[PDB]
Design a protein around this ligand. Structure first.
Ligand SMILES: [Zn+2]
Length: 311
């Protein structure tokens, strides 16, 4: 299709992905209890920061720390914000949440492998696999850069009503609205597209377009799935289209995009609906992930990113 990578550039891009790196260097370290305010959450925050700072492209990496009221009293939250080129007029923003949902004491510990350790790991792997190309685009002052958001506090702490959720995204969207950007006028308007990854890594996911505004990008993802299938680049993928489905959504849900959506940001919500079978149970673990699906999604996203940013 027009603006698609030539086959030769596509196979090179896919070949820069390293499945073992994704799994062991980016995913495995996240698979700990990481509820807001916990030591594990702080350790994951520092791991994300250090990993992002290590990329040779030289990202601007900053924390958005704050304290908020919760059903458990005041709790500290910290969003990790990585912007490749902070001088660029606008950016594609890819987002996910790095907290894990708090369960009661004496429960089987919940580590949220699909929700959202896999999303987090995918963003890290994409940034690393495309690091040389991203570095060159920044050095050329490309007018659209890349931003990665690792949001804290997406999950409710006690399922205690509508304000016990989305702590990090609500705070960050309000913060961005207060910060000037050129041309902006604020950092909210710098977001050209907000792509939220959530509930990824289970077998047999299904994705629908939730926002007519951004359906062209949903169609691009679907076309990339079909193309990779026909190129013999997907595993355990017997039908041409499995993940990106046509039609009205099975259902739409509140998530970290909402504070951005409400401020006019265009959103693509890349979330499995129906949710994974393991959703919000302690069986949402590494062993219940489907590795071929994880790597297939990584490949689809890598091609999407290279096409979107002209890498
Ligand atoms: Zn969840």
């Amino acid at each position: 299709l027009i603006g698609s990578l030539p086959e030769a550039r596509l196979r090179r891009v896919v070949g820069q992905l390293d499945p073992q790196r994704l799994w062991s260097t980016y995913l495995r370290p996240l698979l700990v209890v990481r509820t807001p305010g916990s030591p594990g959450n702080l350790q994951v925050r520092k791991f994300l920061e250090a990993t992002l700072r290590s990329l040779t492209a030289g990202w601007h990496v900053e924390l958005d720390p704050f304290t908020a009221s919760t059903p458990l009293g005041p709790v500290d939250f910290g969003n990790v914000v990585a912007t490749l080129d902070p001088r660029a007029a606008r950016h594609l923003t890819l987002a996910c949440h790095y907290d894990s949902k708090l369960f009661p004491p004496g429960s089987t510990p919940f580590v949220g492998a699909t929700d959202s350790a896999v999303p987090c790991a995918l963003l890290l792997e994409l940034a690393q696999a495309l690091d040389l190309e991203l570095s060159r685009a920044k050095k050329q002052a490309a007018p659209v850069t890349l931003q990665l958001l690792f949001l804290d506090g997406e999950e409710a702490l006690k399922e205690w009503g509508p304000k016990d959720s989305l702590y990090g995204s609500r705070h960050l969207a309000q913060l961005m609205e207060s910060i000037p950007h050129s041309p902006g006028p604020t950092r909210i308007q710098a977001i050209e597209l907000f792509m939220l990854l959530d509930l990824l890594g289970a077998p047999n996911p299904t994705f629908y377009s939730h926002f007519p505004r951004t359906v062209r990008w949903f169609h691009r993802l679907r076309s990339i799935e079909k193309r990779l299938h026909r190129l013999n680049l997907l595993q355990s993928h017997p039908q041409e289209v499995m993940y990106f489905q046509p039609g009205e959504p099975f259902g739409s849900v509140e998530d970290d995009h909402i504070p951005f959506l409400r401020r006019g940001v265009p959103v693509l919500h890349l979330i499995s609906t129906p949710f994974p079978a393991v959703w919000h149970t302690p069986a949402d673990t590494e062993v219940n992930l489907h590795p071929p699906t994880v790597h297939n999604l990584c490949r689809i996203l890598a091609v999407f990113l290279a096409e979107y940013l002209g890498l």
